[PDB]
Amino acid sequence: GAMNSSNYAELFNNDIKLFVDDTNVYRVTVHKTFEGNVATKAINGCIFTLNPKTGHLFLKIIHTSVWAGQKRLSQLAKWKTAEEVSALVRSLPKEEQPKQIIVTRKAMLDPLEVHMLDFPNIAIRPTELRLPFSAAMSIDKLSDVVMKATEPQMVLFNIYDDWLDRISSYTAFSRLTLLLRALKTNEESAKMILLSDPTITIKSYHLWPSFTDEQWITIESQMRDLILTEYGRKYNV
Amino acid sequence: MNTVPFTSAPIEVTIGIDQYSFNVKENQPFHGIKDIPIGHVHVIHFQHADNSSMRYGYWFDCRMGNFYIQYDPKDGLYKMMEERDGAKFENIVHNFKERQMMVSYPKIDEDDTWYNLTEFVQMDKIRKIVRKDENQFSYVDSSMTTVQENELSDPAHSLNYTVINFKSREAIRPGHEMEDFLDKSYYLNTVMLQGIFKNSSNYFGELQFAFLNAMFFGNYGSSLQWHAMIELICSSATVPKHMLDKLDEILYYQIKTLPEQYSDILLNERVWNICLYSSFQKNSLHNTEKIMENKYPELL
Ligand SMILES: N=C(NCCc1cccs1)NC1CC1
Numbered sequence: 224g225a226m227n228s229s230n231y232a233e234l235f236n237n238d239i240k241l242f243v244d245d246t247n248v249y250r251v252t253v254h255k256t257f258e259g260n261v262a263t264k265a266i267n268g269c270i271f272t273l274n275p276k277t278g279h280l281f282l283k284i285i286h287t288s289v290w291a292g293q294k295r296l297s298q299l300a301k302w303k304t305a306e307e308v309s310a311l312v313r314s315l316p317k318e319e320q321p322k323q324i325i326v327t328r329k330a331m332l333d334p335l336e337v338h339m340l341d342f343p344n345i346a347i348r349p350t351e352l353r354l355p356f357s358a359a360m361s362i363d364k365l366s367d368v369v370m371k372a373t374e375p376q377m378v379l380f381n382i383y384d385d386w387l388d389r390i391s392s393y394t395a396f397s398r399l400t401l402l403l404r405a406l407k408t409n410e411e412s413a414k415m416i417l418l419s420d421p422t423i424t425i426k427s428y429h430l431w432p433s434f435t436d437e438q439w440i441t442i443e444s445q446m447r448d449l450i451l452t453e454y455g456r457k458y459n460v
Numbered sequence: 461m462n463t464v465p466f467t468s469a470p471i472e473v474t475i476g477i478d479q480y481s482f483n484v485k486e487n488q489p490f491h492g493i494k495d496i497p498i499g500h501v502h503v504i505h506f507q508h509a510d511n512s513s514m515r516y517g518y519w520f521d522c523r524m525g526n527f528y529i530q531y532d533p534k535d536g537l538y539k540m541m542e543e544r545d546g547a548k549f550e551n552i553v554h555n556f557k558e559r560q561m562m563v564s565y566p567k568i569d570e571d572d573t574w575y576n577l578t579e580f581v582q583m584d585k586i587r588k589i590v591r592k593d594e595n596q597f598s599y600v601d602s603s604m605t606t607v608q609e610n611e612l613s614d615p616a617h618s619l620n621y622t623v624i625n626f627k628s629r630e631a632i633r634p635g636h637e638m639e640d641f642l643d644k645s646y647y648l649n650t651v652m653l654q655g656i657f658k659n660s661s662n663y664f665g666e667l668q669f670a671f672l673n674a675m676f677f678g679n680y681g682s683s684l685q686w687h688a689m690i691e692l693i694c695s696s697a698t699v700p701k702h703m704l705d706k707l708d709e710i711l712y713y714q715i716k717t718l719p720e721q722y723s724d725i726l727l728n729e730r731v732w733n734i735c736l737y738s739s740f741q742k743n744s745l746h747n748t749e750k751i752m753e754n755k756y757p758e759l760l
Binding site: 299334 | 637
């Protein structure tokens with residue numbers, strides 16, 4: 224059924240699985256109109272679909288044109304997400320299709336189940352983990368491609384860069400979630416940590432800087448401090 | 461007016477006939493039920509004093525034959541049988557009536573309750589849901605499962621209700637996933653009404669028969685079927701006006717007749733609250749909403 228602390232290592236076994244996060248699909252700014260009413264203006268979004276074992280990120284960019292003339296957009300966004308995930312699975316060879324899809328919000332369960340009725344062997348699961356994937360738009364290169372898009376577009380990334388050369392997928396996922404948790408709790412502090420040292424660069428084909436093993440330990444420690452100590456400034460402890 | 465004679469009542473049992481019921485003591489001089497209104501299906505049902513577990517009974521229509529009840533001491537239940545010798549049957553019933561050994565079906569003259577509960581229920585459709593073509597009457601009990609229940613184990617003993625499943629390819633057209641899941645009109649009107657049931661009278665008949673089995677026998681799969689058939693209508697934005705008006709009347713009498721004391725186990729809080737207050741038809745069931753709010757405001 225659901226996915227939580229007790230069955231965490233299942234993420235890194237050899238059954239293909241994908242996480243789907245829809246929290247950045249429908250994005251708006253809220254502003255005042257000339258008449259003094261309030262109105263939204265949508266901006267580009269993205270579906271975050273990640274294989275946690277390989278790091279393969281299927282970033283479907285949601286262009287604002289897909290909302291034109293539509294009503295009840297928050298509800299539509301969940302079905303559009305489900306339609307796009309279903310289209311992705313159909314585009315993959317059978318041996319690359321997931322055996323499970325884990326949605327980060329339970330409201331995606333029924334839209335995805337309906338769109339995947341053709342795949343009764345693919346399990347659609349929620350999770351009790353509070354995963355920080357909404358902070359994906361705090362990764363500069365991902366934000367850049369989403370905002371620059373003028374049409375629907377799928378962009379492929381490895382969100383683990385080359386880390387799996389040196390560490391396991393369990394450790395790679397733990398690092399990713401720590402970085403994203405930090406970016407979600409205090410983006411400016413998190414980014415300052417990541418880029419403070421001008422000599423550690425981000426390779427053109429990567430998302431994160433080229434830290435050595437020792438530097439990653441320092442970074443990971445600094446991110447844990449942030450999450451504990453921003454927790455302090457917000458919560459008087 | 462027709463008659464269902466009993467050979468005898470060897471075991472203490474509560475006997476139901478339609479919405480009526482009465483207690484027969486072990487070896488009491490009971491020889492059946494007389495004055496049964498012609499023109500309606502009927503149900504005669506039983507609950508033994510010694511094992512309230514297992515409520516069972518027979519759907520029948522006196523126009524389709526002469527039927528009687530006889531206890532079987534091997535199988536341990538009151539069984540319905542058909543008497544083919546018409547002279548022997550009239551003779552038997554005449555003697556039992558002359559000795560006043562029969563209870564009278566106690567229909568008050570003002571009272572359209574049974575008609576209103578069985579308006580669309582036909583014996584021929586009952587026999588397609590309860591398969592046992594060798595008899596003209598149909599046996600049902602508390603524990604029989606439905607075809608859909610068996611898909612989620614003896615097929616001869618199942619209730620063959622129409623499978624309704626809102627997350628099925630039958631329910632959902634490719635390319636209309638969101639449309640068809642949030643507005644079930646296609647599934648109601650095209651798949652079920654035009655395709656399977658052919659007309660709304662047959663749909664209402666199965667709905668009414670499911671309610672009555674659920675209510676009389678505590679049959680859980682029937683209860684699921686009754687709610688599913690209500691929810692399909694209430695979750696459709698486009699329903700013929702006459703069907704909504706009739707549904708309101710159907711449900712009204714069902715809610716009126718339900719034992720207050722079993723509402724907690726026969727009424728699904730989620731379905732009723734959704735249907736009356738959230739669905740497309742939330743404003744279309746005036747009589748049902750009024751009786752529900754005045755009789756079971758707890759459930760809501
Ligand atoms: N990083 C890639 N391609 C492989 C990495 C993958 C991520 C997702 C599926 S494969 N980029 C291609 C566009 C140039």
